[PDB]
Design a protein around this ligand. Structure first.
Ligand SMILES: CO/N=C(\C(=O)N[C@H]1C(=O)N2C(C(=O)O)=C(CSc3nc(=O)c(=O)[nH]n3C)CS[C@H]12)c1csc(N)n1
Ligand SMILES: CO/N=C(\C(=O)N[C@H]1C(=O)N2C(C(=O)O)=C(CSc3nc(=O)c(=O)[nH]n3C)CS[C@H]12)c1csc(N)n1
Lengths: 112, 114
């Protein structure tokens, strides 16, 4: 049901987790590298999800801020995107946001 | 400054009142300038009449963090969350050709107009 959406519109939850929705975390260019074991398992049910989601772009900002491309490979036609989002280092929450992001970025490297 | 400007950049939404340039900067070739949008999309933002056919490819917050390669960089300008990824078009969708035309129409369109 949740799995019938195009990948880019899926919402991961406990019932349909980040692995089920977006594949396993890993180093390859086609894989996602973000999330510790708790976030992977809980998705948007993760207790600190709101603090992560604040960094996710609106549809307008995704198409507004990103460098957008199209590539045709053996596997199909792809809309590529890259960009950068500046953290608000003036907010008191800055230091905690850094700790949160650092806990999830490439977290899979330490999994048993 | 407009209240629409007071959102963090990534949470800003461009419209006729507060346009793509105002919200997200002039389109251009540089590494973290946006390169997407013709003159009509730039002016109109989500008011563009074909916005829905573009937005269908935009990621949910969950998918943005699930699909993308995420990094952090600390530089003289601040701390930046970097992202890269790719979203697969459905080449079985009868509307696929038209999706490709619409995307291509906005990708690097700025090159053809001041
Ligand atoms: C009828 O529009 N009234 C507007 C308005 O929305 N402003 C416009 C503005 O600068 N826009 C632009 C453009 O930027 O080129 C355009 C595109 S330019 C254009 N469109 C045509 O369809 C056409 O036949 N010829 N041209 C030259 C559309 S109106 C808008 C307005 C703003 S304040 C006020 N009192 N009226
Ligand atoms: C002397 O005319 N000056 C014009 C002009 O083209 N006049 C209008 C005319 O009859 N057209 C009308 C309409 O009739 O509604 C419209 C439709 S309304 C509209 N279209 C947009 O694309 C947009 O972004 N916003 N809006 C509100 C377009 S301009 C033109 C103009 C356009 S940009 C600019 N600086 N001047």
């Amino acid at each position: 049901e949740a799995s019938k959406k195009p990948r880019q519109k899926r919402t991961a939850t406990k019932a349909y987790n980040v692995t089920q929705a977006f594949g396993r975390r890993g180093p390859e260019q086609t894989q996602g590298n973000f999330g510790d074991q708790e976030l992977i398992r809980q998705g948007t049910d993760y207790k600190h999800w709101p603090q992560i989601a604040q960094f996710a772009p609106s549809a307008s900002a995704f198409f507004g801020m990103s460098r957008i491309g199209m590539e045709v490979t053996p596997s199909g036609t792809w809309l590529t995107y890259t960009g950068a989002i500046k953290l608000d280092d003036k907010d008191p929450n800055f230091k905690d946001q850094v700790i949160l992001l650092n806990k999830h970025i490439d977290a899979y490297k330490t999994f048993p």
